A = this chain, B = another copy of it.
Amino acid sequence: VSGSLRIAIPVSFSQELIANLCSGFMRLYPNVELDVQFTDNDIEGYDIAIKYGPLQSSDLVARLLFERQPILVASPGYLKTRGTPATPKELSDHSGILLGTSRSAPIWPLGKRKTMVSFQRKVRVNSPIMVKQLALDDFGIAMLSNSACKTELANGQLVPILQEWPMEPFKVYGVYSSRRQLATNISAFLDFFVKRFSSQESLQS
């Protein structure tokens, strides 16, 4: 396992988390050089693109890496001031904190009871760090990973709402070219990535 590995990762991934992962990877494989770009471009000479599902027709070779379960939450202060929405249709009268890029719409798919609803777009940002802080700071309703916020849920700083209409889990994949189907550095990296996001101190985002 050697050579160079150029990897694209959405801006919504935690840079702290990916840093810890790449450190452990390089410790195991000392002869690999890394070029990691946090970017929201739809992938430019990349060996691996990390992507959220669903995969597109251009994604001809891919590996499922992990899944996460989002949940809708707000702070108790927000719910005291604005009320607790009783059904998804009431989200239209509520402030939401949208995780998205410059063409992402303030629409959330809820239920399985399956429906798509809008909300007042108080903030749009492509940073989960900022989404979480703004939710804690009483600004409105946010979709957060149930694993990313277990402490805040346990201590009541975030409150789950509309639990009768759960969201579909999201899946994360690694996409790579069939030209590199035999590449040992790609396989080594994705194996290490899967082990971290499945059994580790890394299940925090």
List the interface of chain A (C-beta within 8 A of B).
Answer: 11, 15-16, 18-20, 22-23, 26-27, 33-41, 44-45, 101-102, 121-127, 129-130, 132-134, 137, 139
Contact = CB atoms under 8 A, between A and B. Distances in A.
Count identical subunits in the complex. 2
A125 B11 CA distance: 12
A36 B130 contact: yes
A132 B38 CA distance: 16
A37 B125 contact: yes
Closest 3 CB pairs of A and B: A19-B130, A19-B133, A15-B129
A108 to B, nearest CB: 17
A39 B40 contact: yes
Contacts of A23: 133-134, 137, 139
Given A36-B126, A38-B125, A38-B127, 15 more contacts: A11-B39, A20-B133, A22-B123, A22-B125, A22-B130, A22-B134, A23-B133, A23-B139, A26-B134, A34-B124, A35-B123, A36-B124, A36-B125, A36-B127, A45-B102
A123 B21 CA distance: 13
A26 B139 contact: yes
A149 B19 CA distance: 16
Q: Which applies to chain A's interface (DSSP): helix, strand, loop or mixed?
A: mixed
A130 B137 CA distance: 27
A121 B3 CA distance: 12
Contacts of A38: 11, 125-127
Contacts of A15: 15, 127, 129-130
